[PDB]
Amino acid sequence: MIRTMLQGKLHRVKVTHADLHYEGACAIDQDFLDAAGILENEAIDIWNVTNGKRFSTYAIAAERGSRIISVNGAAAHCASVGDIVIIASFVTMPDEEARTWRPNVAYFEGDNEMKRT
Amino acid sequence: MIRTMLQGKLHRVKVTHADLHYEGACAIDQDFLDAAGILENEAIDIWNVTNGKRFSTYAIAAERGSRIISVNGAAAHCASVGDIVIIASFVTMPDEEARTWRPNVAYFEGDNEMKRT
Amino acid sequence: MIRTMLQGKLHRVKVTHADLHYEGACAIDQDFLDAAGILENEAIDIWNVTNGKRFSTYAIAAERGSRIISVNGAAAHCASVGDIVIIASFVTMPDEEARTWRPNVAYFEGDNEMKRT
Amino acid sequence: MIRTMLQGKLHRVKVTHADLHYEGACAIDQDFLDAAGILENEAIDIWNVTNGKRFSTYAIAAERGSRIISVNGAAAHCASVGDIVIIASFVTMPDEEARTWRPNVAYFEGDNEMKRT
């Protein structure tokens, strides 16, 4: 049987933009997406450390190096600029592969600077 | 391993009807379903740009050309006539196919007129 | 790629019992489970037509013929005796099978009497 | 077609720690994880019997024998020390295997002592 496992997450990144109109999804610096192994158009869950809200949407790429985290469309009701959020994707696999599965985790410092190790 | 990807969405369509009783689900003009690639009886997520609510239900077909978006049953607690919503379906596939996956997106103008390109 | 489709639902059944302690899940007359094609220990979504709440739990069997719908454990915070709810399960399959997929739907009358056709 | 089934649960365990900062997820005594068959980095749903909240996160191991249930990061908004929660994982399998599927259930007494049978 098949497990759902954490694929990767952006841990405690800060929302940089929030615009109800127009567009939607959560636009994320492509460098951040690569670090966490998250793909453009992949389903993502967003857990807001600042306000406690939890919601699910999908990832789109923002410009590499922009350090952008933009919550757009209806999702803009769920976060504000400055909020600290955790952004996660999940994947499925057989139990055997799940047992030794390792998520990609990206950590942050300062103004959404990616932290090493 | 297997990714969950955005299959397609109706972007910023307007709710035309909301009836708590009876029936359920979200009835959507079949032309809209075809445009976004969404199937009758497929699980859909609905993100309400107007009121911020997010909920999951399933799609049923409304008459082709009716331009109808009817939120029925318990879902009628989550949207009102006139609300702007995003309606999405998600599918799973191997990582390799996910990397070059392209969602179907349908956009709207005026009174739920589908916008081209 | 793989679609998530409505497998079956109990449409507008009434909650008969709600006990926060102890046990959990939603216990459902086995005849109702068979009618909707829902299995013991299968994940189910519950949409409360009366109070608007939406939550996910799993199905357990109640005695055949009891006409019971018991919301237990934490789920008892989400429904009250007398509430009208829709109980659904979802399954996955290839797109080809999804295109002609037919959900099992069970309808109700009076005191959770299953309605024919 | 493929069913989503309850894999296992921790039934009515008590939250021992809740820290918004830092880390995230829900750290759970590894002995408890083994008992319910839940894996490190597996998606889990948490249903709070005390306050009614329901949320989804992922499991991480706490020290074997610590009897720890720590809700961390954004999840700390959803439970408090002392809350009674049910922690569940779900897996997918073909309908045939689902029909005779048996979830692992772990029960608790006193100060998160695992109860036998």
Rounded Cα gap, residues B74 and B72, in angstroms: 6
D26 has a chain A CB within 8 A of its CB: no
Query: What φ, ψ does residue C97 adopt, rounded to 5°?
Result: -65, -35
Residues in chain D with CB shorter than 8 Å from the CB of A86 are 24, 73-74
- Between chains, do A86 and D7 touch, taking CB under 8 Å as contact? no
Q: Please tell me what resolution, in angstroms, this structure has.
A: 2.0
Which residues of A15-103 form beta strands (DSSP E)?
17-19, 26-29, 43-48, 54-62, 69-72, 84-94
D56 has a chain A CB within 8 A of its CB: yes
| Residue from A72, A29, A78, A76 nearest A53 by CA | A78
- Give buried/exposed letters for D37-67 (b at 16+ CB in 10 A, else e): bbbbbbbbbbbbbbeebbbbbbbbbbeeebb
Q: How far is B116 from chain C (nearest CA, A)?
A: 26
Contact, C81 vs C40, CB < 8 A? Answer: no
Contact, B41 vs B30, CB < 8 A? Answer: no
Rounded Cα gap, residues D80 and A50, in angstroms: 16
Closest Cβ–Cβ partner in C3, C52, C88 for B39: C3
- Between chains, do A6 and D73 touch, taking CB under 8 Å as contact? no
Query: What φ, ψ does residue C25 adopt, rounded to 5°?
Result: 70, -170
Rounded Cα gap, residues A28 and A9, in angstroms: 12
The length of chain C is 117
Residues in chain D with CB shorter than 8 Å from the CB of A2 are 2, 91-93
Cβ neighbours, 10 Å, residue B63:
11
Q: How far is C43 from chain B (nearest CA, A)?
A: 14
| Burial of B42 (C-beta count, 10 Å sphere; 0-12/13-18/19+) | buried
Contact, C79 vs C85, CB < 8 A? Answer: yes
SS3 C33: helix
Contact, A35 vs A104, CB < 8 A? Answer: yes
**In Å, what is the CA distance from C100 to each residue of A29, A72, B21, C96, D21?**
40, 35, 27, 8, 49
Handedness of CA D35, D37, D43, D45 (dihedral sign): negative
**In Å, what is the CA distance from D39 to each residue of D6, D62, D88, D100?**
14, 12, 11, 22
Half-sphere exposure of D14 (CA within 13 A, CB side): 12
Ordered structural domains, chain C, with CATH: 1-117 (2.40.40.20)
C99 has a chain D CB within 8 A of its CB: no
Closest Cβ–Cβ partner in D47, D51, D101 for C41: D101
Give B87's contacts (C-beta < 8 A, 6+ positions apart).
Answer: B9, B10, B13, B26, B28, B36, B38, B44, B45, B46, B47, B59, B69
**In Å, what is the CA distance from A24 to each residue of A67, A72, B48, C75, C111?**
18, 4, 11, 32, 44
End-to-end CA, chain A = 33
Q: Solving technique for this entry?
A: X-ray
| Residue from A44, C109, D44, A14 nearest B90 by CA | A44
- Which of B20, B33, B34, B91 is best to mutate for the C interface (most C CBs within 10 A)? B91
- Between chains, do D74 and A95 touch, taking CB under 8 Å as contact? no
For residue A58, what are its two tokens?
A: 């999908």
- Between chains, do B24 and C86 touch, taking CB under 8 Å as contact? yes
Closest Cβ–Cβ partner in C39, C57, C74 for D48: C74
For residue A77, what are its two tokens?
A: 């009701």
Handedness of CA C79, C21, C24, D68 (dihedral sign): positive
